[PDB]
Design a protein around this ligand. Sequence first.
Ligand SMILES: O=C(O)[C@@]1(O)C[C@@H](O)[C@@H](O)[C@@H]([C@H](O)CO)O1
Ligand SMILES: [Zn+2]
Lengths: 218, 219
Amino acid sequence: EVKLVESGGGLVQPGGSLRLACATSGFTFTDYYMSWVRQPPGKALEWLGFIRNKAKGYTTEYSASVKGRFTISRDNSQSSLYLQMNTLRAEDSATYYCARDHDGYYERFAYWGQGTLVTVSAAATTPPSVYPLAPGSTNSMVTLGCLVKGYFPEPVTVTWNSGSLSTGVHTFPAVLSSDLYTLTSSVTVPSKTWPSETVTCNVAHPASSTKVDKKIVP
Amino acid sequence: DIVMTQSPSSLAVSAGEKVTMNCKSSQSLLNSRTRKNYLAWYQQKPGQSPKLLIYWASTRESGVPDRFTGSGSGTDFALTISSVQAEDLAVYYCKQSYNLRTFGGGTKLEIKRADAAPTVSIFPPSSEQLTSGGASVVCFLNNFYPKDINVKWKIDGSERANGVLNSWTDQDSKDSTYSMTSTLTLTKDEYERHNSYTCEASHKTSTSPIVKSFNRNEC
Ligand SMILES: O=C(O)[C@@]1(O)C[C@@H](O)[C@@H](O)[C@@H]([C@H](O)CO)O1
Ligand SMILES: [Zn+2]
């Protein structure tokens, strides 16, 4: 299994610095160029730079958009890749992805991480309030929800019954208002399964290390 | 300095139909020594990381369904899906690697399907929220098509527009529908002054609005 995992993402003030890391496994690290790529929320992919393999002496290159400001490095004893970002500004808010690049032959980014979200803002971290949305009232299916209100920055994650309820889930894109986000999630299950069998939304807010479970009760 | 442009910016196609999207570079990506075009295509389904589909213009990565074909040479490339499936909903990106790397701005592929009415659900403010001083009323308009839809909130029978925010999801990768939430936020003091809370959904699928309501006195 090839694995790439970014970490380091979160809230930083304008003018501040942040380093991301990309941990890799499942392939011969030194044989590969590694690239970083970013994507502002709802926008296009932007290639940022790469660091070459051992054959090419681990040299770096950068897009004009970040050259002189971002720094890439790698730890070949640990199979790790880094991105140091300096003098951050609003245009830098984005999900950052590390991708496995050129091996001296193939021209492709064969593997990507899950990405880590960086928010550049002076607004303060605020944990969510999490509220149950229990159904009033007699059909074959029933819809429940959780309201995740008043948090900053993105992201938050919402699962239902620890991820065991995956079909019939809708988590709605957050909306920003007064430097705070709100989102909600619905899940739709058979009426034979609630309240007889429990339904619980699990909310995480990494920026505040918030972990919440709200069981939906009649 | 290679400029990559993609067209169309978006388009919608029904399952089973062909689609073609295009990618143009400001300079040739045909490498003279290797005799190949350094041009790859990536698929990014909603909320996921990009995935490689095609590299060297026309080489299909292992695991990629055969309905995906890359074509072209020099400055003009295409990605064609012979017969689209619900799960092909994505943004598609082309990328050059002839000189460093540069992504095009993407083409957003939407799936067209039969019109479908929304399933509507309304929820009162929780006691936890009310105890804290706030009152959010939530309405889910779920699994409908097409995307355009209107919601009207009524308090004791009168329309309220202030304090309503809406949010659509991305298209569903299984049934090709959209869903939307509408959230009316009020103070506890104003919430407690009225009884009837109504969410009214108007969609092209019916001349009759779908109406859901609850009464505070019935909670
Ligand atoms: O700049 C390079 O290190 C590199 O080898 C990257 C390759 O992807 C490719 O762009 C190559 C050019 O084809 C020149 O050989 O340069
Ligand atoms: Zn150089």
